[PDB]
Recover the amino acids of this structure.
RNA sequence: UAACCGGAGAGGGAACCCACU
């Protein structure tokens, strides 16, 4: 069973150990019923410059809402974050992929908007 | 304990909205890099028609590469200054770097404005091929793009050539780290 | 190798929806519209009904050596 | 047999430790002398080492699969001298650059920066939630 | 040879005298935890 | 100093999901309402899997996992049954358990898809949810090999396992135009509207209220199909009553011990 | 390898009781009630009802550790008024309130299958 | 031998040689049996090695460089097939390397060998040492086109996950993650580990002879104190027997 | 007392006594397998 | 006209390569 302390990997090199495990009532949640799985580090992101990870998560949300497999070829230069935000506005969600999260303990909304979405992880 | 709980109530994220800038400053960056590129092409044409007067103490080639490095450093510094002037003060990048936790003002510049010129062994990228850095460029050209300057940002994406140049830089950093750790271990053992 | 029965986030029932998904893709609908026709509104269930790979057909294509 | 299980004063017991015992704890390579600190042992259910970011900061520790070593002294005087020399409050500050080395980790640093921003106006329920976690709290609410 | 057996890094002088194998020494991966004080470390039940 | 007068109304009802609105109550109470839907609602799920003979390429632990994650029908017999851990009987007794059987021999050339329909039940009030559409697939069986097993289903809640969590999804929210200003919008125009928002298309942002409380909670309860959502709410509230009653009795005895 | 079995979250074993009491010395008329093997799904609403009470000066709830199923509550109420009867009164008020929610929800759902129209 | 080459397009004029007729047969492959070798025979493309790459000029894009504009050199002789083809087996599954950092790309490409998943199709038959296999492999949501050429659509490694970029509890300061107990209960990343053992009995010149047999406490000597009830009569553990460490 | 074994490629059952060549009775196949134990197995669904 | 006996230390090593810090 995946316990705490196992090593989990993105597709961009952010190595991460499983800290703790809370129950589904204990994790936060959106206005709908979606609850997240992983809480990665917004301090890790600027140090590693994983803007590729940010674009990957946003494109993943776009492709999941669209119903198609997204293409992430490096040297395409035909798709960009502006077109992706256009697809987000087409599907009704926020232009920059942030949403409102709700506390699982208190119930109050989180003061800041929170980034969310799917990606591909691997345990090691 | 109490700062962790206040952070639990507050919430702190990073996102594309934080990493994106506005079109007017984007146009400022394109105008700045276009001015720098036409200026360095003017300097290159000056060296081609040999109006370049060599500085005493170094050759004409060294003077020319000093001129190129000075122009590119000034352009990159102006680009970073313009971006950090326009970081819009709601960026979590700005907030966390002001807190001093991680990252740097230049790291905002690479992630947002432009990567800039990358240097191998303290200079530009040499002509590994026959007087050319890549076969994708012509023979005997001294353009910043053809010699290792990146005109794009991380948000904009990179051409495969400058991606190869960034790979040059990253490999150079990694080999430095490895030999640094090994040699400082041996030296510390010697001192002990 | 098998479709999970439940959404990892939600818990909505998924196991029948895989064979239904194959039936609709054989009936030649665009897969997103067929997914909406099956009625998976949330993307956290759309992902598992969309990008599930099946291996058990290869495993059963192998002969049973333990008979 | 219970005749063997009978005890008298002066015997040696190889007993399982409980909370409060002093252990030494390090990471190879020991680049700096701050890299091995004494600590008090405590028990948590899931099976890994649990520790503080203020101890990771001198340890050069960053949780990407880095494992630590944990030695426990057997002799009581060795345990006492480890307790009274190599302990983290006793060696908060390094001699080489006369600077503190415990520090504050990045997430709590950014959070306390946004907390010490000038325009912070905190609700009574949240201040109520906050002032249990002060260990050295006097027990009286301050004026808003 | 014995000259090799002592001049080696696994030799008697270094790999067996300066640094030697010791018991009473566990080793495992770690996990962040802010809810305990800076002086405390939490260990697994099997280790204890 | 005393409790207010909250109000309850329901917009629409469907078998899979229900939608309702609560007013004049605390955000803490509403959050606990969502959590008591999620956690302690008792249902019936398969727990004890004995395997006589497995020759499928899927392993026995995997088979037990999928059997435990099969949902079941738990209308009122979950309230009739008692906890297995507390019921004093040898192994499982029918007062605290339900018996299931699954014997499949794929003897046909085509792959025989083992389905939730093929689970033989001991009590008619409990079946897989799918029976009373395509059945829930369990394992695809090649010709020649078989799978014979017995099972017992018991009563548990989501503090144990998500298989005993019956709620497929809760959508709990409030203040559709951030009038309480719990969030700060750097780009409120760029922020998309909520479906409960009544603000103008030009504004899309309610004015700040200096004096107010978060109110008018919207609830969307999506069941997994095991129970009716109204019965789920009633069971959750009943369990909350029981837990508070036990806490009251125990702490009253604690006060009696102190004095 | 050392996984906690699931009932460790909710099953109270022999040797310990649900509620323990300790009198604080930092401020008088302050009492600490420790609830064993239960979490914020009751902690939050008990502190909500305590904040609804105006007779308490300070209220507080905290879990000593998330993986240790336990919560403590420190309450310091006004002198002439006792935290124990305050706590019981808050709980029984919450009980009456949630019961009222329960019958109101039955009448609402019954209104729904008979038809709002 | 020993020279390393890659296929590149051949362009003579300002216009290329890879015509719509040829791409029509290539699209209607598996019927005309039109092959890559048939394309090489057509002479549209050719193998280019290092010295020849040194001495030839390249056209980076036919749609961008070979098209008529402000001319760079207008002496283009060869053209690359696709720039992403300079990547490798792990860099292919790396998404957005033009956005990522090079140390991150190198780290991720190294970690791709540690990326755990269904390694081979017939792992139940293939009895190897230190095998790992996940319950629920999934293809990635967003990827490059090269993955299904590397057969990553059929034998992937990992699960698409709903992550939340935030700092929620504070148990994730430095390179740490928090996870769903309920999903992990529902099947999220639950894997299973395989370890194989072996033994070769030997027959010698009657001095010491090894034979597979259940040891006996009174008969055999030098035994380590453990159980032997799980051991069968011949000395083999049957399949389907639960067993822990320090056991025969 | 003798063991019940499975040939594999024959998928057939045979009886094997100890200190005997490991061959199928009708084909002599060296790859050879043992049957599942008769001892009971249960699994809690966690 | 006969009466309470109890038994647990281990067995190679050496090289190469890979991985992680
Ligand atoms: Mg490290
Ligand atoms: Zn879902
Ligand atoms: Zn019973
Ligand atoms: Zn045979």
């Amino acid at each position: 069973i995946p316990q705490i302390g196992d090593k989990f990997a993105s597709r961009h090199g952010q190595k991460g150990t499983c800290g703790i495990q809370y129950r589904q009532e204990d994790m936060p949640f959106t206005c709908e019923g979606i609850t997240p799985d992983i809480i990665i580090n917004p301090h890790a992101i600027p140090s590693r410059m994983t803007i590729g990870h940010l674009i990957e998560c946003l494109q993943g949300k776009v492709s999941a809402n669209k119903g198609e497999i997204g293409d992430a070829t490096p040297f395409n230069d035909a798709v960009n974050v502006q077109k992706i935000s256009n697809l987000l506005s087409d599907y009704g969600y926020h232009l920059r992929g942030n949403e409102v999260l709700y506390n699982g303990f208190t119930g109050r909304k989180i003061t800041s908007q929170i980034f969310i979405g799917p990606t591909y992880y691997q345990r090691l | 304990t109490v700062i962790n709980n206040w952070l639990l109530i507050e919430g702190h994220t990073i996102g594309i909205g934080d990493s994106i800038a506005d079109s007017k400053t984007y146009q400022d960056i394109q105008n700045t890099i276009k001015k720098a590129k036409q200026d360095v092409i003017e300097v290159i044409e000056k060296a081609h028609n040999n109006e370049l007067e060599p500085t005493p103490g170094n050759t004409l080639r060294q003077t020319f590469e000093n001129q190129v490095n000075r122009i590119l450093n000034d352009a990159r510094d102006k680009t970073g200054s313009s971006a950090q002037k326009s970081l819009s003060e709601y960026n979590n990048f700005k907030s966390m770097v002001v807190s001093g936790a991680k990252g740097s003002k230049i790291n905002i510049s690479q992630v947002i404005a432009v990567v800039g010129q990358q240097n191998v062994e303290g200079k530009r990228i040499p002509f590994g091929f026959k007087h050319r850095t890549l076969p994708h460029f012509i023979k005997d050209d001294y353009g910043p793009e053809s010699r290792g300057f990146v005109e794009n940002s991380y948000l904009a994406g990179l051409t495969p050539t400058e991606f190869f140049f960034h790979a040059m830089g990253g490999r150079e950093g990694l080999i430095d780290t490895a030999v640094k750790t090994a040699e400082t271990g041996y030296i510390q053992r010697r001192l002990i | 190798m098998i479709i999970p029965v439940r959404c990892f986030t939600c818990g909505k029932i998924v196991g029948n929806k895989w064979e239904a998904y194959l039936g609709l893709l054989q009936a030649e609908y665009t897969e997103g519209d067929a997914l909406d026709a099956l009625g998976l509104k949330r993307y956290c269930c759309r992902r598992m009904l969309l990008a599930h790979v099946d291996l058990i057909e290869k495993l059963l294509n192998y002969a049973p050596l333990e008979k | 047999k219970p005749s063997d299980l009978h005890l008298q004063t002066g015997y040696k017991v190889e007993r399982h430790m409980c909370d409060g015992d002093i252990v030494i704890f390090n990471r190879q390579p020991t680049l700096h002398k701050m890299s091995m600190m004494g600590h008090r042992v405590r028990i948590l259910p899931w099976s890994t080492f649990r520790l503080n970011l203020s101890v990771t900061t001198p340890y050069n520790a960053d949780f990407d699969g880095d494992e630590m070593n944990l030695h426990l002294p057997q002799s009581l005087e060795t345990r006492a001298e480890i307790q009274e020399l190599a302990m983290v409050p006793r060696m908060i500050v390094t001699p080489q650059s006369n600077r503190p080395v415990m520090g504050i980790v990045q997430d709590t640093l950014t959070a306390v920066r946004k907390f010490t921003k000038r325009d912070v106006f905190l609700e009574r329920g949240e201040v109520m939630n906050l002032l249990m976690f002060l260990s050295t709290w006097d027990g009286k609410v301050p004026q808003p | 040879s014995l000259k090799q057996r002592l001049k080696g890094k696994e030799g008697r002088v270094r790999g067996n005298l300066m640094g030697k194998r010791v018991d009473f020494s566990a080793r495992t991966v770690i996990t962040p935890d802010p809810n305990l004080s800076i002086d405390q470390v939490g260990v697994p039940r099997s280790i204890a | 100093p005393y409790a207010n007068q909250p109000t309850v109304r329901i917009t629409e009802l469907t078998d899979e999901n229900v939608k309702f609105i609560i007013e004049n109550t605390d955000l803490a109470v509403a959050n606990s309402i969502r959590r008591v839907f999620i956690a302690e609602v008792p249902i019936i799920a398969i727990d004890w899997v004995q395997i006589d003979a497995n020759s499928s390429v899927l392993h026995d632990e995997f088979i037990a996992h999928r059997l435990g994650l099969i949902p079941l029908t738990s209308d009122d017999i979950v309230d009739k049954l008692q906890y297995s851990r507390d019921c004093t009987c040898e192994e499982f007794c029918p007062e605290c358990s339900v018996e299931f059987t699954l014997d499949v021999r794929c003897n046909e050339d085509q792959t025989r898809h083992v389905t939730s329909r093929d689970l033989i039940s001991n009590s008619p009030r409990v079946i897989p949810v799918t029976s009373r559409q395509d059945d829930i697939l369990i394992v695809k069986l090649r010709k020649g090999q078989e799978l014979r097993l017995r099972a017992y289903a018991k009563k548990g809640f989501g503090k144990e396992h998500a298989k005993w969590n019956p709620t497929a999804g809760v959508a709990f929210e409030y203040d559709p135009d951030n009038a309480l200003r719990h969030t700060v919008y750097p780009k409120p125009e760029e922020w998309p509207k909520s479906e409960y928002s009544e603000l103008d298309e030009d504004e899309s942002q309610a004015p700040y209220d200096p004096n107010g409380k978060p109110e008018r909670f919207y609830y969307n309860v999506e069941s997994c199909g095991s129970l009716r959502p109204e019965t789920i709410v009633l069971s959750a509230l009943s369990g909350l009553k029981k837990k508070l009653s036990d806490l009251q009795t125990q702490l009253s005895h604690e006060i009696q011990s102190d004095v | 390898m050392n996984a906690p079995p699931a009932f460790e979250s909710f099953l109270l074993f022999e040797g310990e009781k649900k509620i323990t009491i300790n009198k604080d010395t930092k401020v008088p008329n302050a009492c600490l009630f420790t609830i064993n093997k239960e979490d914020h799904t009751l902690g939050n609403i008990i502190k909500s009802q305590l904040l609804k009470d105006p007779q308490v000066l300070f209220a507080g709830y905290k879990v000593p550790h998330p993986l240790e199923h336990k919560i403590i509550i420190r309450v310091q109420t006004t002198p002439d008024y006792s935290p124990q009867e305050a706590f019981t009164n808050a709980i029984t008020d919450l009980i009456s309130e949630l019961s009222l929610l329960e019958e109101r929800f039955r009448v609402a759902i019954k209104d729904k299958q008979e038809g709002i129209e | 031998a020993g020279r390393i080459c890659r296929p590149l397009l051949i362009v003579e004029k300002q216009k290329l040689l890879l015509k719509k007729r040829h791409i029509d047969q290539l699209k209607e492959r598996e019927y005309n049996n039109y092959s890559w070798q048939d394309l090489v025979a057509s002479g549209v493309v050719e193998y280019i090695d290092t010295l020849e790459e040194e001495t030839v000029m390249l056209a980076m894009t036919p749609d961008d460089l070979q098209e008529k504009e402000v001319a760079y050199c207008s002496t283009y002789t060869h053209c690359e097939i696709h720039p992403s083809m300079i990547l490798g087996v792990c860099a292919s599954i790396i998404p957005f390397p033009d956005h990522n950092q090079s140390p991150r790309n190198t780290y991720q490409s190294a970690m791709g060998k540690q990326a755990m998943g269904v390694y081979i199709t017939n792992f139940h038959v293939r009895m190897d040492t230190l095998a790992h296999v996940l319950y629920y492999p999934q293809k990635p949501l967003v990827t490059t086109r090269s993955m299904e050429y590397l057969r990553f659509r059929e034998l992937p490694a990992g699960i698409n996950s709903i992550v939340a970029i935030a700092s929620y509890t504070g148990y994730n300061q430095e390179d740490s993650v928090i996870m769903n107990r309920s999903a992990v209960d529902r099947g999220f990343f639950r894997s299973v580990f395989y370890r194989s053992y072996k033994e070769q009995e030997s027959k010698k010149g009657f001095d010491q002879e090894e034979v597979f047999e259940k040891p006996t406490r009174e008969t055999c000597q030098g035994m380590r104190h453990a159980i032997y009830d799980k051991l069968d009569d011949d000395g083999l553990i049957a399949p389907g027997v639960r067993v822990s460490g320090d056991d025969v | 007392q003798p063991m019940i074994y499975i040939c594999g490629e024959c998928h057939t059952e045979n009886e094997i006594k100890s200190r005997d060549p490991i061959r199928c009775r009708e084909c002599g196949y060296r790859i050879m397998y043992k049957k599942r134990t008769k001892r009971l197995v249960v699994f809690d669904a966690r």
The two ends of chain I are 37 Å apart (CA to CA). The CA atoms of residues 8 and 32 of chain I lie 6 Å apart.
